[PDB]
Structures are given as C-alpha cells and as structure tokens.
Design a protein around this ligand. Structure first.
Ligand SMILES: [Mg+2]
Ligand SMILES: [Mg+2]
Ligand SMILES: [Mg+2]
Ligand SMILES: [Mg+2]
Ligand SMILES: [Mg+2]
Ligand SMILES: [Mg+2]
Ligand SMILES: [Mg+2]
Ligand SMILES: [Mg+2]
Ligand SMILES: [Mg+2]
Ligand SMILES: [Mg+2]
Ligand SMILES: [Mg+2]
Ligand SMILES: [Mg+2]
Ligand SMILES: [Mg+2]
Ligand SMILES: [Mg+2]
Ligand SMILES: [Mg+2]
Ligand SMILES: [Mg+2]
Ligand SMILES: [Mg+2]
Ligand SMILES: [Mg+2]
Ligand SMILES: [Mg+2]
Ligand SMILES: [Mg+2]
Ligand SMILES: [Mg+2]
Ligand SMILES: [Mg+2]
Ligand SMILES: [Mg+2]
Ligand SMILES: [Mg+2]
Ligand SMILES: [Mg+2]
Ligand SMILES: [Mg+2]
Ligand SMILES: [Mg+2]
Ligand SMILES: [Mg+2]
Ligand SMILES: [Mg+2]
Ligand SMILES: [Mg+2]
Ligand SMILES: [Mg+2]
Ligand SMILES: [Mg+2]
Ligand SMILES: [Mg+2]
Ligand SMILES: [Mg+2]
Ligand SMILES: [Mg+2]
Ligand SMILES: [Mg+2]
Ligand SMILES: [Mg+2]
Ligand SMILES: [Mg+2]
Ligand SMILES: [Mg+2]
Ligand SMILES: [Mg+2]
Ligand SMILES: [Mg+2]
Ligand SMILES: [Mg+2]
Ligand SMILES: [Mg+2]
Ligand SMILES: [Mg+2]
Ligand SMILES: [Mg+2]
Ligand SMILES: [Mg+2]
Ligand SMILES: [Zn+2]
Lengths: 97, 137, 53
RNA sequence: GGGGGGAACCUGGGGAACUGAAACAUCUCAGUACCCAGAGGAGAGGAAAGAGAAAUCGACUCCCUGAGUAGCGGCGAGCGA
RNA sequence: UGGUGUUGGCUCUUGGUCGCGCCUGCGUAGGAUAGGUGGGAGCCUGUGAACCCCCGCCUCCGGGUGGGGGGGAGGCGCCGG
RNA sequence: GGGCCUGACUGCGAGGCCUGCAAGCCGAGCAGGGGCGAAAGCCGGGCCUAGUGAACCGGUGGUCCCGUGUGGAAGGGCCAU
RNA sequence: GCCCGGAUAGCUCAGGGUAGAGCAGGGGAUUGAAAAUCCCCGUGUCCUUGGUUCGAUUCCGAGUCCGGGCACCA
C-alpha cells in the first residue's frame, strides 16, 4: 500500500516498542523496554469506483477520504466533461482539490 | 381491578414524576373509598437488605400526621423497602407535604454510614385503596 | 525471621501511628501483641497493638 | 515549461555500526555516516489558535548570555532545553 | 488470532440487559399452593358475584391462575381456633 | 525459682575501639515519659563473640514540606517500615 | 501482592428445616475356594469462632489450613 490520491497520506515510520513490568500507576517497579524497532504504518487505501460522464473512474483513496471522492462527483456536475478519456477526467476531478 | 379503581388510574400517568406538592393535591383525588383513607409513603432504600449495621429503623414525630398524634415507627423490611403512614386522606394538602417531607427527612437522617447506591432509589405516595405516584424526594 | 517468626509493627492505640517494629513467633504467640510503649506523638506511654507489617 | 550539472553550504524522504556504558539488551554513538529528492546563490523559518506569570512580551533567522541551569537518565554511561 | 475499517440487503432462530404488565414461591400445625416486611375493616358487583361451558397453562398432582361463551345478587377478610 | 513488669524506650551523645573507603563496634552523661526497688540504684533486649546485604526502583502507615497563572487535585519530599 | 475457592464419618463424595451416599471395616445369608451378589450396623460442633433466624453445614463477618488463579520481584 502507498499514497492516498485524495488526501496525500502516505506510509509513515513508527517504532514498535516492547515492554515488560507492572506500570508504576499499578504499584509496580515500572516498565522496561525489552525491544524497539522500526515499522511502517499504512494508510487504509481502498478502491473507490465511480462513474462520471458515463465513463468509469477509479481512485486509490484512504478509507477516511472515501466520502471525499463522491464530493468530487457532485462538484463534477457543472463540468464540461463529456467525451473525455478516463485519464483526463480523473485529472479533471482531482483538480477541484 | 374494579371500575372504581380503573377510574382513578386515569388521574395518574406513570412516566411523570410529580412533586411533594403535586402529589398532595392528588391524594384527595385518589381517596375514593368509603372512609378516611390514609396515604402511606413507600420508599426503596438503596442499601443491602440481608444485613445489619446498615438497617434503617427509627421514629419521626410528624408535626400534624396520623389524625387517628405523631411519632411513627418505621423499619426497612427484608427487601429494600420501608413504609409508613403520613396521615389521613382528609388533611388539607399543605398539611401532608409537610409530613411527607418531614418523614423523608428522618429516613435520610437514618441512612447508614456504609451504604452503596443513591439510598432513596425511589419514593411513592399513595392511599389505602388508591394507586400511586412517584415523587422527587 | 521465618514464615513463623515474623515481623510486625506496634501501633499506638491512641493516635493509630506505628512507632515500633519488632518480631514474634506466631505459633508460640498467636495473639496480637499488646504492650506499653512511649508514643512520641502523644509524648507519654500508651498501650500499643500489633499491626501487620 | 521541465529533463542534466555544480566544491562546500541548505531543506525534505529514509537511516546504520564500530564505539561508549570498562560484559550487555533499554540507553549511547546519532538522526551522525550514508543513500535519495529538491533547491539556490543561499537555503530553511516567518507576521502567534506564540510565549508563560512579567497585572508581561510581540513575525522569523543568526551571535553572545541565560546554563552544563531547568530537567532527562539500566537516576548508570551519559543526554541537555 | 479477537476487535474495528474497507462492509451491504432480506430472513429464521435466539440470548443478555434496561422499563413496565402480569403470573409462578406447597418443610410441618392447618378451611389449604402462606415469596420478605409494612399498611390496612372493608374491598371484589349493572365496568356482573355463586357454580358452569372452550381452556395460555404452571404443577409439589390437591390445586394455583386467565381470557371469554352460559350468568343474575352474593363471595372474601377483621373475627379466631 | 518467684513477684511485679515492657527500657526488645523516644529525643540526643562526651569520648573511644576498629579501620584505605564504606561499614562494623563500645559508650558515660542530659531531657521526655516509664519499670522494678524501702533505698543505693539498675533498665536504650538477650554472658559474649555468627544468625547477614550498600545503592537504585517500588510498596504500605504517618507528616502536611513542594504543588508548573491561582485554588484544589495529580505527583513528589520528609519520618517509619 | 490481589482475585476465585474447597473443609461434610476411616478414604472419596453430593446437600434456610436433614444429615446422608459409594466402597473400606464388622455381623449374617451363600460358597469347595477367591470373589461377585444380598440383608443389617455403625464411622459427625458439616475447619474455627462470632453474628441472623424460632431455629441452620446452608445467609453473613472474622479467622485457620491445605486447593486453585493472576501478576510481580529491587
Ligand atoms: Mg506496539
Ligand atoms: Mg525505564
Ligand atoms: Mg471514519
Ligand atoms: Mg526497632
Ligand atoms: Mg519476640
Ligand atoms: Mg515527632
Ligand atoms: Mg538542477
Ligand atoms: Mg539537481
Ligand atoms: Mg531529514
Ligand atoms: Mg537527511
Ligand atoms: Mg538497515
Ligand atoms: Mg549497539
Ligand atoms: Mg555492540
Ligand atoms: Mg561496551
Ligand atoms: Mg569496554
Ligand atoms: Mg563484549
Ligand atoms: Mg538520538
Ligand atoms: Mg547573501
Ligand atoms: Mg530567502
Ligand atoms: Mg517558506
Ligand atoms: Mg495573519
Ligand atoms: Mg541519580
Ligand atoms: Mg541520553
Ligand atoms: Mg539525543
Ligand atoms: Mg542554547
Ligand atoms: Mg492482526
Ligand atoms: Mg481495538
Ligand atoms: Mg468486517
Ligand atoms: Mg530469673
Ligand atoms: Mg518506652
Ligand atoms: Mg565519636
Ligand atoms: Mg571508621
Ligand atoms: Mg530517665
Ligand atoms: Mg527512675
Ligand atoms: Mg516506687
Ligand atoms: Mg532517683
Ligand atoms: Mg544509659
Ligand atoms: Mg542501577
Ligand atoms: Mg524510594
Ligand atoms: Mg506522602
Ligand atoms: Mg496549580
Ligand atoms: Mg501546600
Ligand atoms: Mg499552598
Ligand atoms: Mg497548570
Ligand atoms: Mg476552590
Ligand atoms: Mg500527596
Ligand atoms: Zn500515640
């Protein structure tokens, strides 16, 4: 997985921290880190398929921004899109962000 | 239930909570039996029944009350309930709320020191043969 | 000390403050220790009682 | 219009180990080395949803001080506003 | 591998737990199918009692309960073994 | 062997033994409040020399010392364990 | 450390009105024997103490001990 086409969100780097011990809050000696290592956290990208000017357009967008796709289509209403390829329509739509 | 009771039922509505005063004005409207009904005040202490130490028991010397003077003894039953006579259906309304309130006061005065819950989980006013109304203690 | 010879505090019966620590054999001596001890809080002798450490 | 180059410098995306802790794993080395993208004669930052106790100050950057202070820390080695 | 996102429509059967409605609660002495205490001498009847006809039915096997068809003025408690 | 008892004290401590450090050890005397004794007096465990574990981290009972603008609260300090 | 728990006769065991059940032991029937079967019988503060109820192994508090569970250990 890779880059939200609407929000721009991308994989980030996060540590995966391993602990042991009873937290001080719980009356323990405190926590010890038994290991820390890099990992990636991904955006929740999914396929949204959508039909604009009869043609079929398809986005890789993070779940959080699925609604945002459809908002693009509503704002696509008064647009002179007819007769276009899907490639340039997508371009057209993306331009309202 | 008998027509006589079915009647009264209309002048109630469970949902509504009512007020010490609002309930005092109903009592009269709810005492349709051939005699000076009483009134009673049923609570529902939010304490543990099967126990002791946290047992609600005592007396209250109602300013007016009874008319049958005061000092009524009340003691929570095996369940979480406590009941007591607050006066007779006669009594001008502004005379009952004085006792209802004076009795409920004693209850709080006899709450334990180790009791979980809102204590007065619920309270109601009634009459010997009439229905009942919840109330904001 | 052992599981039987145990540690224990002595608490002042009048201010509830522990002022002493000592030990006992709990077989030999199942009952809670009572003893007079100077409580420095109260500034006078007081009967102290065994309290769990 | 872009593409490609430029000793160092700059920013951004990624990012070690020896080593130190007189062993070592958290910690350190160090966000360093290095790779990558971009910039430019600089770059970055910048006109408060800020500071923080002054009833205060007034964008940002850079130097000196504050201070090895405040703190952080297998409360160790150390790190450090 | 649980939870949750992407992830929707219909249905069947279901429990938990919240409010109210009601019924079930039988050691023995006993008119006999007593939930804990409190209140309380009248309540149940032209908003139809006494048994009777189809019965949701539970059952500890006697009965407990509940709607109605028939039905036209008496059943149930203080009383007290 | 008996009688009473809880000094198996709280606040300190002159002066020493030991000794690289850190520890370890002995201690007269004064104050508080006690015990026993008619009293002188003795009593800060046990004839004596083994029966033990620095720190860090944290627990529990006090204390009411600090509390991040202020009042509280969180959390920490301090005494005891 | 905290949470769930069992204790009932010689062994093992189920249980607001109560005190029993399996086989161990003993007596009797039977047998060639060992059994199996069959009939009777014991073997109790129901861990301890304190408290409800008219009273209780039964509800509750407190203890003591083994059983189990989870976690932590400077
Ligand atoms: Mg993780
Ligand atoms: Mg740590
Ligand atoms: Mg969402
Ligand atoms: Mg000591
Ligand atoms: Mg001793
Ligand atoms: Mg002091
Ligand atoms: Mg270039
Ligand atoms: Mg370039
Ligand atoms: Mg960077
Ligand atoms: Mg870099
Ligand atoms: Mg690597
Ligand atoms: Mg390393
Ligand atoms: Mg290494
Ligand atoms: Mg090393
Ligand atoms: Mg080394
Ligand atoms: Mg090595
Ligand atoms: Mg670093
Ligand atoms: Mg310049
Ligand atoms: Mg510039
Ligand atoms: Mg800029
Ligand atoms: Mg502006
Ligand atoms: Mg330190
Ligand atoms: Mg450091
Ligand atoms: Mg650093
Ligand atoms: Mg600086
Ligand atoms: Mg997974
Ligand atoms: Mg989750
Ligand atoms: Mg799913
Ligand atoms: Mg002697
Ligand atoms: Mg003393
Ligand atoms: Mg000295
Ligand atoms: Mg020395
Ligand atoms: Mg003295
Ligand atoms: Mg003396
Ligand atoms: Mg004397
Ligand atoms: Mg003297
Ligand atoms: Mg001395
Ligand atoms: Mg350390
Ligand atoms: Mg500490
Ligand atoms: Mg404290
Ligand atoms: Mg504050
Ligand atoms: Mg303060
Ligand atoms: Mg203060
Ligand atoms: Mg603050
Ligand atoms: Mg305030
Ligand atoms: Mg505090
Ligand atoms: Zn004291």
């Amino acid at each position: 997985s890779k880059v939200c086409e609407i929000s721009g969100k991308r994989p980030i780097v996060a540590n995966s921290i391993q602990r042991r011990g009873k937290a001080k809050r719980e009356g323990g000696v405190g926590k010890k880190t038994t290991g820390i290592s890099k990992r990636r956290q991904y955006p929740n990208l999914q396929k949204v398929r959508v039909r604009v000017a009869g043609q079929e357009i398809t986005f890789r967008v993070a779940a959080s921004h699925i609604p945002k796709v459809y908002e693009l289509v509503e704002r696509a209403k008064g647009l002179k899109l007819e007769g276009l390829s899907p490639k340039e329509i997508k371009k057209e739509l993306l331009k309202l962000l | 239930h008998g027509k006589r009771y079915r009647a009264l039922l209309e002048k109630v509505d469970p949902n509504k909570v009512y007020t010490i005063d609002e309930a005092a004005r109903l009592v009269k409207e709810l005492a349709t039996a051939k005699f000076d009904e009483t009134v009673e005040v049923h609570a529902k202490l939010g304490i543990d029944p099967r126990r002791s130490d946290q047992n609600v028991r005592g007396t209250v010397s109602l300013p007016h009350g009874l008319g049958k003077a005061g000092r009524i003894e009340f003691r929570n039953d095996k369940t979480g309930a406590i009941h007591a006579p607050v006066g007779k259906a006669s009594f001008p309304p502004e005379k009952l709320a004085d006792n209802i309130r004076a009795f409920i006061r004693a209850l709080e005065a006899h709450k334990p020191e180790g009791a979980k819950g809102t204590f007065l989980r619920s309270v109601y006013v009634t009459t010997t043969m009439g229905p009942s109304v919840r109330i904001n203690p | 000390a052992s599981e039987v010879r145990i540690k224990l505090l002595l608490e002042c019966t009048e201010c509830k403050r522990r002022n002493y620590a000592t030990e006992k054999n709990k077989r030999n001596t199942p009952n809670k220790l009572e003893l007079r001890k100077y409580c420095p809080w109260c500034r006078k002798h007081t009967v102290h009682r065994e309290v769990k450490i």
